[PDB]
Design a protein around this ligand. Structure first.
Ligand code: 1TZ
Length: 330
Protein backbone atom coordinates (compact mmCIF):
# COMPACT_ATOMS: atom_id res chain seq x y z
CA UNK A 1 0.00 0.00 0.00
CA UNK A 2 0.88 3.69 -0.34
CA UNK A 3 -0.46 7.07 0.72
CA UNK A 4 -0.04 10.59 -0.69
CA UNK A 5 -1.33 13.79 0.90
CA UNK A 6 -0.84 17.48 0.21
CA UNK A 7 0.56 19.60 3.04
CA UNK A 8 -0.21 23.34 3.17
CA UNK A 9 1.45 26.24 5.03
CA UNK A 10 -0.83 27.65 7.74
CA UNK A 11 0.14 31.25 6.93
CA UNK A 12 2.22 33.54 4.70
CA UNK A 13 5.41 32.80 6.65
CA UNK A 14 5.28 28.97 6.50
CA UNK A 15 5.07 28.93 10.33
CA UNK A 16 3.78 25.37 10.08
CA UNK A 17 2.20 22.94 7.61
CA UNK A 18 -1.14 21.15 7.91
CA UNK A 19 -2.22 17.93 6.24
CA UNK A 20 -5.78 16.60 6.12
CA UNK A 21 -6.31 13.36 8.04
CA UNK A 22 -9.47 11.23 8.09
CA UNK A 23 -10.37 9.83 11.51
CA UNK A 24 -13.26 7.53 12.37
CA UNK A 25 -16.39 6.22 10.66
CA UNK A 26 -17.90 8.14 8.96
CA UNK A 27 -14.72 10.13 8.35
CA UNK A 28 -14.01 13.21 10.42
CA UNK A 29 -11.35 15.19 8.59
CA UNK A 30 -8.92 17.17 10.77
CA UNK A 31 -5.91 19.17 9.61
CA UNK A 32 -2.89 17.89 11.53
CA UNK A 33 0.68 19.10 11.85
CA UNK A 34 2.89 16.18 10.77
CA UNK A 35 5.74 16.25 13.27
CA UNK A 36 8.87 14.13 12.78
CA UNK A 37 10.06 15.40 16.17
CA UNK A 38 7.37 13.71 18.27
CA UNK A 39 5.46 10.45 18.39
CA UNK A 40 1.94 11.18 19.57
CA UNK A 41 -1.10 11.55 17.34
CA UNK A 42 -3.30 13.90 19.34
CA UNK A 43 -6.36 15.93 18.37
CA UNK A 44 -8.64 18.67 19.58
CA UNK A 45 -11.83 16.88 20.55
CA UNK A 46 -15.28 17.00 22.09
CA UNK A 47 -13.43 16.43 25.39
CA UNK A 48 -11.17 19.50 25.10
CA UNK A 49 -11.72 22.19 27.75
CA UNK A 50 -14.11 24.58 25.98
CA UNK A 51 -12.18 27.77 26.79
CA UNK A 52 -9.08 26.20 25.21
CA UNK A 53 -10.71 25.65 21.82
CA UNK A 54 -10.69 28.64 19.48
CA UNK A 55 -11.74 27.69 15.95
CA UNK A 56 -10.23 24.23 15.64
CA UNK A 57 -12.12 21.33 14.09
CA UNK A 58 -12.69 18.69 16.77
CA UNK A 59 -12.78 14.90 16.76
CA UNK A 60 -15.97 13.57 18.37
CA UNK A 61 -15.41 9.90 19.21
CA UNK A 62 -19.07 9.37 20.16
CA UNK A 63 -19.98 10.00 16.50
CA UNK A 64 -17.55 7.38 15.20
CA UNK A 65 -18.81 3.80 14.98
CA UNK A 66 -15.23 2.49 14.97
CA UNK A 67 -14.00 4.51 17.98
CA UNK A 68 -13.18 2.54 21.13
CA UNK A 69 -12.01 4.03 24.42
CA UNK A 70 -8.60 2.63 25.38
CA UNK A 71 -9.49 1.84 28.97
CA UNK A 72 -7.25 3.48 31.57
CA UNK A 73 -4.87 5.08 29.10
CA UNK A 74 -3.82 8.70 29.46
CA UNK A 75 -1.24 10.89 27.74
CA UNK A 76 0.68 14.05 28.51
CA UNK A 77 3.30 15.69 26.36
CA UNK A 78 5.64 18.60 26.94
CA UNK A 79 7.35 19.99 23.84
CA UNK A 80 10.77 21.62 24.09
CA UNK A 81 9.37 25.05 23.19
CA UNK A 82 7.18 25.04 26.30
CA UNK A 83 3.96 23.91 24.63
CA UNK A 84 1.91 21.04 26.06
CA UNK A 85 -1.25 18.98 25.82
CA UNK A 86 -2.82 15.98 27.58
CA UNK A 87 -5.90 13.77 27.78
CA UNK A 88 -7.18 10.24 27.23
CA UNK A 89 -7.05 7.78 24.36
CA UNK A 90 -9.25 6.12 21.78
CA UNK A 91 -8.39 3.68 19.04
CA UNK A 92 -10.02 4.34 15.67
CA UNK A 93 -9.48 4.11 11.93
CA UNK A 94 -7.08 6.73 10.57
CA UNK A 95 -6.39 7.45 6.90
CA UNK A 96 -3.79 9.73 5.31
CA UNK A 97 -3.85 10.29 1.55
CA UNK A 98 -5.56 6.97 0.88
CA UNK A 99 -3.46 4.95 3.34
CA UNK A 100 -5.54 3.42 6.13
CA UNK A 101 -4.55 2.18 9.58
CA UNK A 102 -7.11 0.43 11.76
CA UNK A 103 -6.80 0.55 15.55
CA UNK A 104 -4.61 3.65 15.54
CA UNK A 105 -4.20 5.30 18.94
CA UNK A 106 -5.92 8.67 18.66
CA UNK A 107 -5.05 10.78 21.68
CA UNK A 108 -7.98 12.99 22.66
CA UNK A 109 -6.97 16.31 24.20
CA UNK A 110 -8.61 17.35 27.46
CA UNK A 111 -6.12 20.20 27.94
CA UNK A 112 -3.87 22.16 25.57
CA UNK A 113 -1.45 25.06 26.16
CA UNK A 114 -2.23 28.58 24.93
CA UNK A 115 0.04 28.22 21.88
CA UNK A 116 -2.14 25.41 20.52
CA UNK A 117 -5.37 27.25 21.42
CA UNK A 118 -4.13 30.30 19.52
CA UNK A 119 -3.25 28.25 16.41
CA UNK A 120 -6.80 27.98 15.00
CA UNK A 121 -5.57 26.24 11.83
CA UNK A 122 -3.93 23.29 13.60
CA UNK A 123 -6.40 20.61 14.75
CA UNK A 124 -3.72 18.43 16.29
CA UNK A 125 -0.35 16.79 15.71
CA UNK A 126 0.59 13.55 13.95
CA UNK A 127 3.89 12.27 15.31
CA UNK A 128 6.40 10.65 12.96
CA UNK A 129 9.39 10.15 15.23
CA UNK A 130 10.15 6.77 16.80
CA UNK A 131 7.43 5.13 18.90
CA UNK A 132 9.79 4.93 21.89
CA UNK A 133 8.88 8.60 22.54
CA UNK A 134 5.13 8.01 22.65
CA UNK A 135 3.61 9.32 25.90
CA UNK A 136 0.61 7.03 26.36
CA UNK A 137 0.56 5.46 29.84
CA UNK A 138 0.51 2.75 31.10
CA UNK A 139 0.71 1.09 27.68
CA UNK A 140 2.86 2.96 25.15
CA UNK A 141 1.31 3.24 21.67
CA UNK A 142 2.70 3.13 18.13
CA UNK A 143 2.84 5.98 15.60
CA UNK A 144 0.78 5.99 12.42
CA UNK A 145 3.92 5.19 10.42
CA UNK A 146 4.89 2.29 12.70
CA UNK A 147 1.39 0.81 12.38
CA UNK A 148 1.33 1.25 8.59
CA UNK A 149 4.90 0.13 7.97
CA UNK A 150 4.42 -3.59 7.32
CA UNK A 151 1.67 -2.89 4.77
CA UNK A 152 3.66 -0.27 2.85
CA UNK A 153 5.28 -1.11 -0.48
CA UNK A 154 8.51 0.23 1.03
CA UNK A 155 8.99 1.10 4.71
CA UNK A 156 9.49 4.83 4.06
CA UNK A 157 7.80 8.20 4.12
CA UNK A 158 8.95 11.39 2.40
CA UNK A 159 8.59 15.06 3.24
CA UNK A 160 8.47 17.56 0.37
CA UNK A 161 7.65 20.90 1.98
CA UNK A 162 7.00 23.93 -0.19
CA UNK A 163 8.35 27.45 0.21
CA UNK A 164 5.24 29.64 0.46
CA UNK A 165 3.43 26.85 -1.40
CA UNK A 166 1.81 23.46 -0.83
CA UNK A 167 3.93 20.34 -0.68
CA UNK A 168 3.52 16.61 -0.22
CA UNK A 169 3.85 13.80 2.32
CA UNK A 170 4.12 10.36 0.67
CA UNK A 171 4.02 7.01 2.47
CA UNK A 172 5.39 3.77 1.10
CA UNK A 173 7.11 5.06 -2.02
CA UNK A 174 9.69 7.50 -3.37
CA UNK A 175 8.42 9.76 -6.16
CA UNK A 176 11.40 9.98 -8.49
CA UNK A 177 9.87 12.94 -10.33
CA UNK A 178 9.89 15.02 -7.14
CA UNK A 179 13.61 15.80 -6.91
CA UNK A 180 16.67 16.62 -9.00
CA UNK A 181 19.94 14.68 -9.13
CA UNK A 182 20.34 11.84 -6.65
CA UNK A 183 19.25 11.23 -3.08
CA UNK A 184 22.15 11.13 -0.62
CA UNK A 185 21.55 8.85 2.33
CA UNK A 186 23.09 9.37 5.75
CA UNK A 187 23.15 7.44 9.04
CA UNK A 188 20.51 7.89 11.75
CA UNK A 189 20.77 7.39 15.50
CA UNK A 190 17.50 6.46 17.19
CA UNK A 191 18.99 6.60 20.70
CA UNK A 192 17.00 9.73 21.63
CA UNK A 193 13.93 8.63 19.68
CA UNK A 194 14.46 11.26 16.97
CA UNK A 195 15.49 11.21 13.32
CA UNK A 196 18.97 12.26 14.42
CA UNK A 197 21.82 12.57 11.93
CA UNK A 198 25.13 14.38 11.40
CA UNK A 199 25.55 17.12 8.81
CA UNK A 200 29.02 17.33 7.29
CA UNK A 201 29.24 21.12 7.46
CA UNK A 202 28.03 24.45 6.13
CA UNK A 203 28.61 27.47 3.90
CA UNK A 204 27.29 31.03 4.14
CA UNK A 205 26.31 32.49 0.76
CA UNK A 206 29.07 32.09 -1.80
CA UNK A 207 31.64 31.47 0.95
CA UNK A 208 33.89 28.45 1.32
CA UNK A 209 32.38 25.29 2.76
CA UNK A 210 33.38 24.55 6.36
CA UNK A 211 33.78 20.82 7.03
CA UNK A 212 32.49 20.19 10.54
CA UNK A 213 30.20 17.58 12.11
CA UNK A 214 26.84 18.97 13.19
CA UNK A 215 24.56 16.51 15.00
CA UNK A 216 20.89 17.44 14.85
CA UNK A 217 17.35 16.21 14.22
CA UNK A 218 15.18 16.36 11.11
CA UNK A 219 12.04 17.94 12.58
CA UNK A 220 9.11 18.86 10.33
CA UNK A 221 7.25 20.19 13.36
CA UNK A 222 9.77 22.97 14.05
CA UNK A 223 9.58 26.15 11.97
CA UNK A 224 13.17 27.36 11.99
CA UNK A 225 16.73 26.09 11.66
CA UNK A 226 18.51 25.92 15.04
CA UNK A 227 22.29 25.47 14.93
CA UNK A 228 25.37 26.03 17.16
CA UNK A 229 26.07 29.63 18.12
CA UNK A 230 29.36 29.65 16.18
CA UNK A 231 27.60 28.70 12.94
CA UNK A 232 24.70 31.08 13.46
CA UNK A 233 27.05 33.97 14.29
CA UNK A 234 29.00 33.32 11.08
CA UNK A 235 25.73 33.45 9.11
CA UNK A 236 24.37 36.69 10.56
CA UNK A 237 27.78 38.39 10.35
CA UNK A 238 27.18 38.53 6.58
CA UNK A 239 24.01 40.59 7.00
CA UNK A 240 24.52 44.33 7.57
CA UNK A 241 22.80 45.43 10.76
CA UNK A 242 21.86 41.95 11.98
CA UNK A 243 22.10 41.34 15.71
CA UNK A 244 20.94 39.04 18.45
CA UNK A 245 18.20 40.57 20.59
CA UNK A 246 17.33 39.14 24.00
CA UNK A 247 14.18 41.29 24.09
CA UNK A 248 13.01 39.86 20.77
CA UNK A 249 14.31 36.35 21.44
CA UNK A 250 16.85 35.81 18.70
CA UNK A 251 18.61 37.24 15.67
CA UNK A 252 16.84 40.08 13.88
CA UNK A 253 17.91 41.96 10.78
CA UNK A 254 16.88 45.09 8.87
CA UNK A 255 13.89 44.26 6.69
CA UNK A 256 15.68 46.10 3.82
CA UNK A 257 18.40 43.42 3.72
CA UNK A 258 18.99 40.84 1.01
CA UNK A 259 19.78 37.62 2.88
CA UNK A 260 22.60 35.30 1.79
CA UNK A 261 21.88 31.61 1.21
CA UNK A 262 22.89 28.91 3.69
CA UNK A 263 24.29 25.57 2.58
CA UNK A 264 24.34 22.41 4.71
CA UNK A 265 26.24 19.20 4.06
CA UNK A 266 24.77 15.72 3.67
CA UNK A 267 27.76 13.46 3.17
CA UNK A 268 29.54 14.81 0.09
CA UNK A 269 26.29 16.41 -1.10
CA UNK A 270 25.10 19.95 -0.44
CA UNK A 271 21.64 21.39 0.19
CA UNK A 272 21.24 25.12 -0.46
CA UNK A 273 18.68 27.15 1.48
CA UNK A 274 17.94 30.33 -0.50
CA UNK A 275 18.18 33.58 1.43
CA UNK A 276 14.45 34.29 1.08
CA UNK A 277 13.66 31.11 3.08
CA UNK A 278 15.44 32.66 6.07
CA UNK A 279 13.21 35.78 6.19
CA UNK A 280 10.40 35.53 8.75
CA UNK A 281 9.18 39.09 8.35
CA UNK A 282 8.61 42.03 10.72
CA UNK A 283 8.94 41.21 14.44
CA UNK A 284 5.67 43.11 15.00
CA UNK A 285 3.22 44.64 12.54
CA UNK A 286 4.79 47.61 10.79
CA UNK A 287 8.27 47.10 12.22
CA UNK A 288 11.36 47.49 10.05
CA UNK A 289 13.13 44.81 12.10
CA UNK A 290 12.69 41.29 10.70
CA UNK A 291 13.06 37.93 12.43
CA UNK A 292 15.73 35.52 11.20
CA UNK A 293 15.01 31.94 10.19
CA UNK A 294 18.36 30.67 11.43
CA UNK A 295 18.73 30.81 15.20
CA UNK A 296 21.04 29.50 17.92
CA UNK A 297 20.35 26.09 19.43
CA UNK A 298 22.29 27.03 22.57
CA UNK A 299 20.08 26.21 25.54
CA UNK A 300 17.84 23.93 23.47
CA UNK A 301 20.33 21.12 23.96
CA UNK A 302 20.06 19.76 20.43
CA UNK A 303 20.42 21.16 16.90
CA UNK A 304 17.18 21.22 14.92
CA UNK A 305 16.88 20.96 11.17
CA UNK A 306 13.40 22.43 11.02
CA UNK A 307 11.23 23.50 8.09
CA UNK A 308 13.65 26.26 6.99
CA UNK A 309 16.17 23.54 6.15
CA UNK A 310 13.82 20.70 5.22
CA UNK A 311 11.74 22.69 2.73
CA UNK A 312 14.90 23.22 0.64
CA UNK A 313 15.08 19.46 0.06
CA UNK A 314 13.19 16.31 -0.82
CA UNK A 315 13.62 14.29 2.36
CA UNK A 316 13.35 10.51 2.73
CA UNK A 317 12.64 9.08 6.15
CA UNK A 318 13.72 5.48 5.68
CA UNK A 319 12.21 3.27 8.38
CA UNK A 320 13.97 0.06 7.41
CA UNK A 321 15.38 -2.15 10.20
CA UNK A 322 18.36 0.21 10.28
CA UNK A 323 16.83 3.65 9.65
CA UNK A 324 18.51 6.26 7.46
CA UNK A 325 17.68 9.72 6.11
CA UNK A 326 17.96 10.79 2.49
CA UNK A 327 18.23 14.34 1.10
CA UNK A 328 17.93 15.46 -2.52
CA UNK A 329 17.80 18.91 -4.07
CA UNK A 330 14.60 19.80 -5.90
C1 1TZ B 1 13.69 26.91 23.04
C2 1TZ B 1 13.03 26.02 21.97
C3 1TZ B 1 12.33 26.60 20.91
C4 1TZ B 1 11.73 25.81 19.93
C5 1TZ B 1 10.97 26.56 18.81
C6 1TZ B 1 11.84 24.40 20.00
C7 1TZ B 1 11.18 23.52 18.95
N1 1TZ B 1 10.31 22.66 19.28
N2 1TZ B 1 9.50 22.01 18.29
C8 1TZ B 1 8.79 20.91 18.59
O1 1TZ B 1 8.77 20.41 19.72
C9 1TZ B 1 7.98 20.31 17.47
N3 1TZ B 1 8.56 18.99 17.10
C10 1TZ B 1 6.46 20.22 17.80
C11 1TZ B 1 5.84 21.49 18.37
C12 1TZ B 1 6.12 22.10 19.54
N4 1TZ B 1 5.38 23.17 19.69
C13 1TZ B 1 4.55 23.33 18.63
C14 1TZ B 1 3.61 24.34 18.40
C15 1TZ B 1 2.87 24.27 17.20
C16 1TZ B 1 3.08 23.23 16.28
C17 1TZ B 1 4.04 22.23 16.52
C18 1TZ B 1 4.76 22.31 17.72
C19 1TZ B 1 12.55 23.82 21.08
C20 1TZ B 1 12.75 22.29 21.27
C21 1TZ B 1 13.14 24.64 22.04
Amino acid sequence: STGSATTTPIDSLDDAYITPVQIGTPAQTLNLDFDTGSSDLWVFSSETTASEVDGQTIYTPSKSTTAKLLSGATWSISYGDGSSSSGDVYTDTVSVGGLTVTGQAVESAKKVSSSFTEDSTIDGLLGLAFSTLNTVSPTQQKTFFDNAKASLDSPVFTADLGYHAPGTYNFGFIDTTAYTGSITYTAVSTKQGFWEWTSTGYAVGSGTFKSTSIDGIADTGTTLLYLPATVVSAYWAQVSGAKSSSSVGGYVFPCSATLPSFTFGVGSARIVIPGDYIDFGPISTGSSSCFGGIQSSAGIGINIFGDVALKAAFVVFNGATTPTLGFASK
